[PDB]
A paper describes a structure:
With the exception of α-hemolysin, which is homo-heptameric, leukotoxins are bipartite toxins, formed by the non-covalent association of two distinct proteins, a class S and a class F component of approximately 31 and 34 kDa, respectively, into a likely octameric species. [name]-[name] leukocidin (PVL) is associated with necrotizing skin infections, such as boils, and plays an important role in the poor prognosis of necrotizing pneumonia. Two additional structural domains are also found: the rim domain anchors the protein to the membrane surface, while the stem domain, closely apposed to the core β-sandwich in the soluble form, contributes two β-strands to the pore β-barrel. Since the binding of [name] to the membrane is a saturable process, the necessary presence of a [name] receptor on the cell surface was thus proposed. This was recently confirmed by Spaan et al. who showed that the C5a receptor is required for the binding of [name] to human neutrophils.
The mutants exhibiting significantly decreased binding abilities with respect to wild-type [name] were: R73A, [name], T244A, H245A, and Y250A, with Ki values ranging from 1.8 to 6.2 nM, i.e. a 69- to 238-fold increase compared to the Ki value of wild-type [name]. Four [name] mutants (R73A, [name], T244A, and Y250) displayed significant alterations for all measured parameters, i.e. at least 50-fold decrease in affinity for hPMN membranes, 2-fold decrease in the slope of Ca2+ influx and 2- to 10-fold reduction in pore-forming capacity. Crystals of the [name] mutant were obtained at a lower pH 6.50, but the conditions were otherwise identical. The latter belonged to the P41212 space group with cell parameters a = 104.86 Å and c = 106.87 Å, 1 molecule per asymmetric unit, and diffracted up to 2.33 Å. In the case of the rim domain, wild-type [name] and mutants T244A, Y246A and N248A displayed only small differences, with r.m.s. deviations comprised between 0.20 Å and 0.30 Å, whereas the structure of the rim domain of the [name] and Y250A mutants were markedly different, with r.m.s. deviations of 1.10 Å and 1.28 Å, respectively, when compared to the wild-type [name] structure. Other significant variations in the conformation of the rim domain were only found in the structure of the [name] mutant, where residues V179–Q186 were affected, as well as in the conformation of the Y250A mutant, where two loops (V179–Q186 and R241–A250) showed structural variations. As the result of the [name] mutation, the hydrogen bond found in the wild-type [name] structure between Y184OH and S249OG was lost, and the loop was reorganized with a displacement of 6.0 Å for the CA atom at position 184. For both [name] and Y250A mutants, crystallization was achieved in different conditions than those for wild-type [name] and the other mutants, resulting in a different crystal packing.
Numbering used by the authors: 3 to 121, 126 to 244, 248 to 284
């Protein structure tokens, strides 16, 4: 749990695993403390992994028998925040808007406080992210020196019907209903991306600096969750056909938030709370 990355430099590693069956979330956090004699600041690389269940559900609408609903994650939320004035968020990955099916990036470190969030010469330490986001797009929703938040949202779909936007109210609505079971007014699982039928496996990185001797502890709040949309499929007769309608941002910030405290001196980590 201690890796030597060079003369006067080492990485002290800690991990925290925290799950919520209520939110359907697992936070697998890697806390890599960068101890370097040539770097005048405390530094910590946080690798945010785990799982966010999609919580996709299908149900009959009110007292009807012609209207069926699909409650699905329009977006996944991944957020990190500190309330410490002595901490600075110095880099994070992914930085830019990315629609690639797979997101794989590397953070590099070179002795003397040199971080290369660009991916010449080798690194003293590296950390890699890797996640799949088929039909979704990743982009930073918010950033400042104390926080970063990504949105991984429904983007572009090709179902059995054609090329659709993640905002299109007809998205996931079936052409013909299979039965009166509410699932059956919506496209089968092989027409659904994994982020809709199963969930998201996040892989995000953030690096923070801390002014040495300004305080031994800092709190970090990490949030993992979803913004749920509701798609209604209405059976009509022209023999039966389905017409789609959407309640966009039906349930926002359905998130599991965990508060962590790091000790810069002892490299120890506690969980202070969660919802």
């Amino acid at each position: 749990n201690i890796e030597n990355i060079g003369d006067g430099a080492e990485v002290v590693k800690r991990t925290e695993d925290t799950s919520s069956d209520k939110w359907g979330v697992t936070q697998n956090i890697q806390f890599d403390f960068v101890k370097d004699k040539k770097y005048n600041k405390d530094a910590l690389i946080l690798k945010m992994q785990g799982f966010i269940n999609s919580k996709t559900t299908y149900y009959n609408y009110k007292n009807t028998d012609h209207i069926k609903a699909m409650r699905w994650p329009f977006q996944y939320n991944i957020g990190l925040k500190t309330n410490d004035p002595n901490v600075d968020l110095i880099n994070y990955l992914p930085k830019n808007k990315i629609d690639s099916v797979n997101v794989s990036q590397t953070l590099g470190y070179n002795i003397g406080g040199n971080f290369n969030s660009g991916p010449n010469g080798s690194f003293n330490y590296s950390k890699t992210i890797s996640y799949n986001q088929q039909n979704y797009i990743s982009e930073v929703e918010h950033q400042n020196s104390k926080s970063v938040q990504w949105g991984i949202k429904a983007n572009s779909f090709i179902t059995s019907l054609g090329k659709m936007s993640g905002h299109d109210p007809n998205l996931f609505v079936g052409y013909k209903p299979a039965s009166q079971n509410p699932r059956d007014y919506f496209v089968p699982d092989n027409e659904l991306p994994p982020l809709v039928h199963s969930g998201f496996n996040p892989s995000f990185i953030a690096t923070v600096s801390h002014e040495k001797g300004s305080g031994d502890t800092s709190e970090f709040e990490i949030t993992y969750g979803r913004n749920m949309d509701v798609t209604h499929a209405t059976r009509r007769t022209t023999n039966s056909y389905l017409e789609g309608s959407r309640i966009h941002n039906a349930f926002v910030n359905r998130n599991y938030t965990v508060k962590y405290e790091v000790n810069w001196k002892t490299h120890e980590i506690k969980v202070k709370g969660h919802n």
